Design a protein around this ligand. Sequence first.
Ligand SMILES: Cc1cc2nc3c(=O)[nH]c(=O)nc-3n(C[C@H](O)[C@H](O)[C@H](O)COP(=O)(O)O)c2cc1C
Ligand code: SF4
Ligand code: SF4
Ligand code: SF4
Ligand code: SF4
Ligand code: SF4
Ligand code: FES
Ligand code: FES
Lengths: 441, 227, 226, 120, 156
Amino acid sequence: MKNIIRTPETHPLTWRLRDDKQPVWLDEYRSKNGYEGARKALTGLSPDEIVNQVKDAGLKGRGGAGFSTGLKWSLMPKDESMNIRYLLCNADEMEPGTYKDRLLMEQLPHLLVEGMLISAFALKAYRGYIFLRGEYIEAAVNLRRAIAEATEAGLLGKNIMGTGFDFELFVHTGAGRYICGEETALINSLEGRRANPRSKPPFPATSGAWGKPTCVNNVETLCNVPAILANGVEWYQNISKSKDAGTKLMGFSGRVKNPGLWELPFGTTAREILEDYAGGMRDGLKFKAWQPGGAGTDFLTEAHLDLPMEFESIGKAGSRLGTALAMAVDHEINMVSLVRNLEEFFARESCGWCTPCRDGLPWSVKILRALERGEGQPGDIETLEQLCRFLGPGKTFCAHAPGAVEPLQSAIKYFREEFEAGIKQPFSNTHLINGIQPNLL
Amino acid sequence: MATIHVDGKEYEVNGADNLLEACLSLGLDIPYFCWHPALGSVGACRQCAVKQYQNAEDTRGRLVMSCMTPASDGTFISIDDEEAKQFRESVVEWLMTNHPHDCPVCEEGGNCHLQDMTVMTGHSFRRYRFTKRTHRNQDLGPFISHEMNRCIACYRCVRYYKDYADGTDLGVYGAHDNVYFGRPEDGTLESEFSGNLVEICPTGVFTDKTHSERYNRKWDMQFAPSI
Amino acid sequence: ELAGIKDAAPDATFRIRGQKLAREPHRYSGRTAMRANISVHEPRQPQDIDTMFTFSMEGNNQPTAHRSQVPFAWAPGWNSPQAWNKFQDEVGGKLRFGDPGVRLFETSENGLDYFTSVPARFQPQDGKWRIAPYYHLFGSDELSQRAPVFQSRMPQPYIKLNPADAAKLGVNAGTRVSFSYDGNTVTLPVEIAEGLTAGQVGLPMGMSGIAPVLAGAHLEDLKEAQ
Amino acid sequence: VACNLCAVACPVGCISLQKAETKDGRWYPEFFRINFSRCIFCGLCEEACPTTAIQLTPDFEMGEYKRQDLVYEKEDLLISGPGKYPEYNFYRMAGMAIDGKDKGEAENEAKPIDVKSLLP
Amino acid sequence: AFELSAAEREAIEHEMHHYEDPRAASIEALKIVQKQRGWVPDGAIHAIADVLGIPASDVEGVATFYSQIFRQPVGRHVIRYCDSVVCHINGYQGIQAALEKKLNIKPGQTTFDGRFTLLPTCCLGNCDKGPNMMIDEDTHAHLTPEAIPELLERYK
Ligand SMILES: Cc1cc2nc3c(=O)[nH]c(=O)nc-3n(C[C@H](O)[C@H](O)[C@H](O)COP(=O)(O)O)c2cc1C
Ligand code: SF4
Ligand code: SF4
Ligand code: SF4
Ligand code: SF4
Ligand code: SF4
Ligand code: FES
Ligand code: FES
């Protein structure tokens, strides 16, 4: 609700935000407990114990999969001879409904710089690349200006803080493709290739960018670690009494009274987020459905509110938590138009590598256009069901396809009345030919 | 070296090999487009799907790709599993949604791998009623004719031309369902090994221009072993 | 020294369990219509005595037939070159019963001595020009340059000169420049080759006029064409 | 269109033909030869044809003094009209481009979109 | 008769230092050329190929894959309006109908004047603040159709 007592304890990432919404630079950042984490890390802690601390903390990736960060960081090789390692920060954020990292990169850039410095010291990476989206222009100016500001305080370059560690940071903007957010296709885009995904195994922990050990991490995953080191792991586990540790940037969007984004701990139920934080729907509209975590997530109903925002709690509820940024769909939006728009986006953003994505999704969108205009034929609904069945996990080359079909199968499963209300014409894909009698079924 | 269990039977295979060349070595017909013995497996076409179980007692497993799965000892697979057969037929159908009505006037007719895999899967009934995507062609020399409408996006041409042959003037362009295989601009393919594309491409996109002057189908040809 | 040629192929009495090896696919068509414009009667299929193959489709082309000489690959359900997978023991390996052909000579027990004929370094000469051979895939072979489809694929005949040799001669790219070989006179347009070392003249061997015997020869006279 | 399906589907092998191609790109037979001395009128050729070009008509009036004159060339077989199916045209269906039919002028075919188009 | 200017080359070789391979700079190099000219002409593909030491088919593949890299002539300003799902909920269709009524050019086309080339785009990352559009490097949020003409006035 409109007044919230933002404290360093319960809002570690976002308590540094000023009332005029302008970014906070290195002189102001170090006055309000800035970079002390990276001093204790570079001067006091070894990389291996830092990795063990991050594993004990139980930090999970905020990019939409929720894999453990310390185990992934422990997948890196144990061979000293392989001294060329890279740290890549997935700052693409092209999924519809995802605007969280824009706040962190526009207003708190030194948080990301410090977090990548700590993660690089843990992973022994000499070079770091921030994979920023190329549409975010003011994020790129503030990131590069704050990086050039941090180069004269001795936090980057050579002999940083007197230790032998050498870390050099770069910002390179993207060219505007959604599949660049997939981590192996992010590595391929960084190499200057068409951003096809790669087959796993091998993993980028062993063979990544330029065949070197690499670790792709979301922006918020890297921004969480300075809080861990500055305050402690013992503080970090006991933020929430829930199976997921730490805070998450959760928000609600659509035509609601107060659409926005607030940092909240895990286990917050939808009712307070929608009506206490977002202020509920606009007056004279009732609530029909909600997507919990962006466009790739399954649609949910009113019964699925009052339910905690966890990976395994939403997982057993028939959906995926994703980015945790929720979408409201009201009663005056036709669901067929929403699904047709979603499939248009997913179909048109396919990289084209694998057959069931390249060819299935255009068929699904054309069927949805036929249903929307009212020319749908009786075989259309079973074709959409077959498309969703055969586009599940493991059958396509990457995870863009299951994420494309999850809203389609959830919207057909819960709202089949509208989808089956546009089938007013029978099935005919053939024209009569004179002199040839047809085969009558 | 390794022992595998296929549809209940048991076979002896090389562990280093993947499952597609293992099952093809035993005479088990699995359809495929993107795999080639020389070029290797990339996993693009998704046509070689088989059902893999965790052990002999697992009744419900997962669909994997036999070109991308090693033929390790203890592997339990089913080529003829009903869900695998439905998926392979569906993949053929998705490739058939945009294919031109050209077999009478296609030089690959009677020698086309796509025709063989379509019959082998058993897909004979069209459900797609919408418009088809079309492409314009390019001129690729006096040797190779180009008909991009027939492309199935198997990526064999770029994998042969760039990786294997180290040619520089053939690539893939575009995105999603608009992928275009060819040159940046019209002009003769400069590589000394350009003509193997006629065997490498499983459809009639790249065809022999010297044969299309006096064309006849393969069943009418008389062959002898020569040097 | 040519004793191995018996094992290159079997003899004309070789049979696949009593069958002759087929040359024609089993669905070969039109056998009573190819020659129906000359004579409406059917000539007899030519008999073969030289080889085990028959000039007909009445023979054997089984993938598992015990043979090494396979005329073409075809299997039920495999009409493409991927039917070659049916003819191998493992796919991508060797032919099932062995590849045709035998090596005439084995590795010798002992080797040779060192050749002590060390050449002197190349020196250009005034008047004499060494002929540097340039080869072309579509020009150097005698039979295949008579194919009509190569007439457009061959480049124009060119004589390649170092830029310094064209600067001392005073010519540039495109200037026809006549030369003399064996008392004959040939004129061809000039091209510039930076990687070609000075004192040499690049010629395309095996073309119409430039025999490949010219490699290592000398051009006595070279002057601007008029 | 000289597709050579009628020649291979004939059980007795009474059809010989060769494909020709115009500069326009239309496939057509350079020569078409039917040996009517051996033809049994089984009709497998008519049902094999995917263009309805070859058809069987109610006309049995044949008889000749020499067997050499029973071989029919293309000028003895090509009639002035469409026969049993007045309206079917195969090239309207086919993707191949001929005069009057550029790419995207076939049935159920969309316009060609170039890879350089600004729309993603 | 295309020639790459010596400052585009100076910027390309400046940004080539940040990678093991010059291929990795190819995308950025293309954007530099577009920054100078609005779009990538056909000769810039071979120019970039010969400077970076990669084949021209790789540069053209990269340029055709990425939506923002333009290979067809564009206008003075590129109107990029969001048509994604949150903007579908907030009503982009009225903004599209207003823009395409004013300009009279359906999406993907160019105005007779050439001042503006209307293009749809994916989610701009400003979803919570309403229907969104970008004109060149300027983002406009909280869009209403009534505000469209005056906004156009800003860009003349
Ligand atoms: C099609 C697709 C798009 C993706 N886009 C993004 C993205 O934009 N940002 C992101 O952080 N992760 C994205 N991911 C997830 C990444 O592949 C990867 O799981 C993540 O970057 C791991 O980082 P994390 O541990 O910090 O979550 C995407 C995945 C797929 C399959
Ligand atoms: S499944 Fe679709 S999005 Fe994923 S790699 Fe294949 S074509 Fe691209
Ligand atoms: S290329 Fe193959 S599938 Fe395509 S029309 Fe020709 S024969 Fe048929
Ligand atoms: S052109 Fe041929 S080889 Fe290349 S993708 Fe298409 S079908 Fe495959
Ligand atoms: S169109 Fe009919 S008659 Fe002509 S070649 Fe084809 S099948 Fe034979
Ligand atoms: S009708 Fe005559 S030409 Fe046709 S298949 Fe029968 S025998 Fe052959
Ligand atoms: S051939 Fe095996 S997945 Fe494509
Ligand atoms: S979803 Fe509409 S601009 Fe972001």
